[PDB]
């Protein structure tokens, strides 16, 4: 009965995409009881699903390399939709490890076999993960192309509220990347209301963070700090004290408190973020708190350029542009127009690289 268990793996995937944890645990136990007395590469499909299941668990509540060992072991002569799941899931994992070059390579290999995918929901999953990594790479038009396909499929179906809220995140954030904050606030707000409907604390705090990015773009720095403070509260009050994404909120608050000329609170916030970033062992976010410190405290420019180059070798030209924007503006306000020239030039370089 190899088809009966592969069918149950399909249902396991369906409950994974629906973010139904009890159903996912039920079908994990059912399938695992079948694997013992079973006749293929089905063991890879099972392992592939154990991998995807783990990514859902990690997202809900913060090793995996053992599952990567069973995935990377004996992948000889792949074909069909199993090859699609292979490249797609490996791309999701590479995206979670700040490996953008590899995640894009895997996503494109999963895209070649997309006609093998019959479920509109599964294609919506692919389109959303591709639009996500395209927003992070600031390929705004490509990200919009994929995100509208994904959200149309999700909204056509029911109970995919979590994935629709994330699609609202991507849509609004691309509008924000086009200097349209008032066009991005409706989507972030809509996602916030639906985030408190399913009582998804992580999504609520992320909605507060994106809305604060809108107030930051409009230079309403107090309202931005309000969103950042309440997002930090929501994260560190609901079991998300050690989730890496909370650093993105602390970091923005560090800029905002620093921009409001509150040097002391900014000193403390940059310290909170640098310490927690070292604790969670995230070198990327750590060097980004190092930039804000070297810029807003002791004006260390060689350190700024060392960090900007580091961030470029990680293919994170978006964060390179954001930080060079911070430095060029800060030095321009201090009448230091020579070094302000240098960092505005780096913003131009990053924008051209993104193309």
């Amino acid at each position: 009965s190899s088809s009966k268990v592969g069918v149950k793996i399909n249902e396991w995937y369906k409950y994974i995409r629906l973010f139904s944890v009890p159903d996912s645990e039920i079908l994990k136990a059912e399938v695992e009881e079948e694997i013992r007395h079973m006749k293929h590469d089905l063991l890879l499909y099972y392992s592939l699903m154990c991998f995807r299941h783990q990514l859902m668990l990690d997202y809900l509540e913060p090793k995996i390399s053992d599952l990567l060992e069973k995935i990377e072991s004996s992948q000889t002569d792949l074909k069909g939709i199993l090859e699609y799941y292979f490249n797609f899931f490996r791309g999701m994992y590479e995206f979670e490890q700040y490996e953008y070059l590899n995640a894009i390579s895997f996503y494109k290999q999963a895209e070649r076999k997309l006609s093998l995918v019959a479920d509109e929901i599964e294609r919506a999953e692919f389109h959303y993960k591709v639009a996500e990594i395209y927003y992070h790479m600031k390929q705004t038009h490509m990200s919009m192309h994929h995100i509208v396909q994904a959200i149309d499929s999700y909204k056509a179906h029911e109970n995919y509220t979590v994935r629709v809220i994330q699609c609202s995140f991507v849509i609004g954030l691309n509008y924000l990347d086009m200097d349209y904050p008032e066009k991005a606030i409706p989507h972030f707000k809509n996602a916030l209301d639906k985030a408190r409907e399913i009582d998804m604390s992580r999504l609520i705090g992320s909605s507060l963070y994106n809305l604060g990015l809108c107030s930051f773009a409009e230079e309403a720095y107090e309202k931005a700090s309000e969103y950042f403070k309440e997002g930090i509260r929501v994260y560190q009050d609901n079991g998300y004290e050690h989730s890496n994404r909370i650093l993105d909120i602390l970091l923005m608050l560090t800029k905002t408190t620093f921009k409001m000329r509150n040097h002391s609170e900014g000193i403390s916030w940059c310290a909170h973020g640098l310490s927690l970033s070292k604790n969670l062992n995230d070198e990327i976010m750590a060097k980004m708190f190092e930039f804000i410190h070297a810029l807003y405290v002791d004006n260390d420019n060689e350190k700024l350029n060392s960090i900007l180059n580091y961030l470029e070798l990680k293919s994170m030209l978006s964060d390179v542009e954001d930080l060079a924007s911070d430095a060029a503006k800060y030095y321009n306000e201090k009448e230091d127009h020579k070094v302000a020239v240098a960092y505005y030039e780096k913003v131009l370089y990053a924008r051209k690289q993104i193309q």
Partner: peptide, 5 residues
């Protein structure tokens, strides 16, 4: 970047 969750 922003949270694409």
């Amino acid at each position: 970047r922003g949270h694409t969750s």
